[PDB]
Scaffold this active site. Structure first.
Site, PDB file in Angstrom:
ATOM      1  N   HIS A   1       0.803  -1.210   0.000  1.00  0.00           N
ATOM      2  CA  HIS A   1       0.000   0.000   0.000  1.00  0.00           C
ATOM      3  C   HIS A   1       0.846   1.276   0.000  1.00  0.00           C
ATOM      4  O   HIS A   1       0.347   2.354  -0.317  1.00  0.00           O
ATOM      5  CB  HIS A   1      -0.986  -0.022   1.182  1.00  0.00           C
ATOM      6  CG  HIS A   1      -0.488   0.653   2.424  1.00  0.00           C
ATOM      7  ND1 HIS A   1       0.005  -0.048   3.505  1.00  0.00           N
ATOM      8  CD2 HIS A   1      -0.438   1.961   2.773  1.00  0.00           C
ATOM      9  CE1 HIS A   1       0.338   0.799   4.463  1.00  0.00           C
ATOM     10  NE2 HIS A   1       0.080   2.025   4.045  1.00  0.00           N
TER      11      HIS A   1
ATOM     12  N   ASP B   1      -0.763  -7.064   2.030  1.00  0.00           N
ATOM     13  CA  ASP B   1      -0.004  -5.810   2.078  1.00  0.00           C
ATOM     14  C   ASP B   1       1.494  -6.064   2.252  1.00  0.00           C
ATOM     15  O   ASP B   1       2.061  -5.834   3.322  1.00  0.00           O
ATOM     16  CB  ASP B   1      -0.511  -4.943   3.233  1.00  0.00           C
ATOM     17  CG  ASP B   1      -0.147  -3.481   3.071  1.00  0.00           C
ATOM     18  OD1 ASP B   1       0.248  -3.091   1.954  1.00  0.00           O
ATOM     19  OD2 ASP B   1      -0.254  -2.719   4.055  1.00  0.00           O
TER      20      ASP B   1
ATOM     21  N   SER C   1       4.349   3.039   8.396  1.00  0.00           N
ATOM     22  CA  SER C   1       3.816   2.027   7.488  1.00  0.00           C
ATOM     23  C   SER C   1       4.886   1.473   6.573  1.00  0.00           C
ATOM     24  O   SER C   1       5.692   2.232   6.036  1.00  0.00           O
ATOM     25  CB  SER C   1       2.677   2.605   6.642  1.00  0.00           C
ATOM     26  OG  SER C   1       1.993   3.644   7.323  1.00  0.00           O
ATOM     27  N   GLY C   2       4.874   0.151   6.390  1.00  0.00           N
ATOM     28  CA  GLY C   2       5.844  -0.517   5.532  1.00  0.00           C
ATOM     29  C   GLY C   2       7.096  -0.854   6.319  1.00  0.00           C
ATOM     30  O   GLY C   2       7.936  -1.651   5.884  1.00  0.00           O
TER      31      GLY C   2
HETATM   32  O1  LIG Z   1      -7.430   5.090  10.833  1.00  0.00           O
HETATM   33  C1  LIG Z   1      -6.583   4.970   9.951  1.00  0.00           C
HETATM   34  C2  LIG Z   1      -5.139   5.453  10.190  1.00  0.00           C
HETATM   35  N1  LIG Z   1      -4.201   5.341   8.970  1.00  0.00           N
HETATM   36  S1  LIG Z   1      -2.475   5.546   9.600  1.00  0.00           S
HETATM   37  O2  LIG Z   1      -2.612   6.545  10.630  1.00  0.00           O
HETATM   38  O3  LIG Z   1      -2.011   5.888   8.292  1.00  0.00           O
HETATM   39  C3  LIG Z   1      -1.584   4.179  10.187  1.00  0.00           C
HETATM   40  C4  LIG Z   1      -1.847   3.765  11.432  1.00  0.00           C
HETATM   41  C5  LIG Z   1      -1.258   2.590  12.079  1.00  0.00           C
HETATM   42  C6  LIG Z   1      -1.609   2.252  13.442  1.00  0.00           C
HETATM   43  C7  LIG Z   1      -0.957   1.063  13.887  1.00  0.00           C
HETATM   44  C8  LIG Z   1      -0.116   0.508  12.850  1.00  0.00           C
HETATM   45 CL1  LIG Z   1       0.785  -0.946  13.069  1.00  0.00          CL
HETATM   46  S2  LIG Z   1      -0.147   1.455  11.404  1.00  0.00           S
HETATM   47  C9  LIG Z   1      -4.395   4.333   8.157  1.00  0.00           C
HETATM   48  C10 LIG Z   1      -5.840   4.266   7.627  1.00  0.00           C
HETATM   49  N2  LIG Z   1      -6.841   4.422   8.711  1.00  0.00           N
HETATM   50  C11 LIG Z   1      -8.206   3.961   8.405  1.00  0.00           C
HETATM   51  C12 LIG Z   1      -8.420   2.563   7.846  1.00  0.00           C
HETATM   52  C13 LIG Z   1      -7.901   1.337   8.322  1.00  0.00           C
HETATM   53  C14 LIG Z   1      -8.428   0.360   7.453  1.00  0.00           C
HETATM   54  C15 LIG Z   1      -8.315  -1.060   7.366  1.00  0.00           C
HETATM   55  N3  LIG Z   1      -8.976  -1.729   6.379  1.00  0.00           N
HETATM   56  C16 LIG Z   1      -9.758  -1.129   5.444  1.00  0.00           C
HETATM   57  C17 LIG Z   1      -9.929   0.289   5.453  1.00  0.00           C
HETATM   58  C18 LIG Z   1      -9.256   1.030   6.471  1.00  0.00           C
HETATM   59  N4  LIG Z   1      -9.212   2.378   6.762  1.00  0.00           N
END
Ligand SMILES: O=C1CN(S(=O)(=O)/C=C/c2ccc(Cl)s2)CCN1Cc1cc2cnccc2[nH]1
Ligand SMILES: [Ca+2]
Lengths: 234, 51
Positions: A42, A88, A185-186
């Site tokens: 991703h 992923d 991420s990653g």
């Molecule tokens: O709430 C968030 C936060 N971001 S983040 O802040 O970019 C990454 C957060 C992480 C927390 C713990 C790890 Cl390990 S990575 C990702 C997308 N997101 C929403 C989300 C998660 C998810 C899972 N599956 C389908 C659709 C989705 N939308």
């Protein structure tokens, strides 16, 4: 990384950083060998052209151990699905080999069975990166690391608003303010066993960061060992 | 066996015909005692760097 501590000198040498055209990191990666970086599929959908940086610990001061590497070929999992973050995982082959030194070394790839029964049953694993320090905060200038306990599969499936496929696993805390976050991420999720660190996950996603009743979701690397092996010879 | 202190193995442990067999990650070689794993060269995988 929300909470945790910063990686001290030589403590997270397998950490790589994907950087965009403007030299800003937007995702993490794990050094697997002199030619390969393991990352989240991703993350590729987050920037047109990017390079990989290794040996970095303070993005605001060239310490000297840093090395930027161009990507020769990107290897995305054929079954990766943007909608659910399933599958992923991605492998990157660099144009030039990474020269290992202080703060630049690979993490070991474990054997699936032994890792699943012995590594994934350890109390914790370690996650790291230059990601946000708070859900709405700015990216980190210092490489950070965090010990995240493995989370019961069922307690995790129950806690999540989205599907937790068989290619994912959870780690972190229910309420404690510690967790990976955007930017990490990653990045690497590794487990220490007798002073040797094995890659066990790829920072994948979560609902926000360090939220109560929410955990950190990682790509279950042990499920893609045969895949990684193949990609690292093509 | 492998469920008992990792079979005394440094790294990988597998149970074959009721016996424990140790092995190591790429870049390591199984010691003479068949349990310890020895780094093949500089900066072997999984080790934090000291210089
Ligand atoms: O709430 C968030 C936060 N971001 S983040 O802040 O970019 C990454 C957060 C992480 C927390 C713990 C790890 Cl390990 S990575 C990702 C997308 N997101 C929403 C989300 C998660 C998810 C899972 N599956 C389908 C659709 C989705 N939308
Ligand atoms: Ca630096």
């Amino acid at each position: 990384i929300v909470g945790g501590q910063e990686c001290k000198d030589g403590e997270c040498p397998w950490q790589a950083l994907l950087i965009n055209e403007e030299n800003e990191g937007f995702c993490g990666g794990t050094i697997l060998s002199e030619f390969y970086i393991l990352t989240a599929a991703h993350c590729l959908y987050q920037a047109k052209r990017f390079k990989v940086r290794v040996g970095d610990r303070n993005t605001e001061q060239e310490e000297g151990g840093e090395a930027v590497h161009e990507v020769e070929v990107v290897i995305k999992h054929n079954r990766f699905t943007k909608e659910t973050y399933d599958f992923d995982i991605a492998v990157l082959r660099l144009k030039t080999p990474i020269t290992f030194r202080m703060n630049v070394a690979p993490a070991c790839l474990p054997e699936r069975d032994w890792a699943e029964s012995t590594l994934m049953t350890q109390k914790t694993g370690i996650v790291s990166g230059f990601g946000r320090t708070h859900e709405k905060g700015r990216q980190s200038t210092r490489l950070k690391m965090l010990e995240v306990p493995y989370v019961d599969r069922n307690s995790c499936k129950l806690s999540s608003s989205f599907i937790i496929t068989q290619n994912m696993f959870c780690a972190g805390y229910d309420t404690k303010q510690e967790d990976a976050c955007q930017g990490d991420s990653g990045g690497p999720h590794v487990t220490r066993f007798k002073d040797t660190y094995f890659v066990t996950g790829i920072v994948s996603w979560g609902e926000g960061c360090a939220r109560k009743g929410k955990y950190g979701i990682y790509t279950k690397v042990t499920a893609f060992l045969k895949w990684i092996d193949r990609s690292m010879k093509t | 066996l492998c469920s008992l202190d990792n079979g005394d193995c440094d790294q990988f442990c597998h149970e074959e015909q009721n016996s424990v067999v140790c092995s190591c990650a790429r870049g390591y070689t199984l010691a003479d005692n068949g349990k310890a794993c020895i780094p093949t060269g500089p900066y072997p995988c999984g080790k934090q760097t000291l210089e």
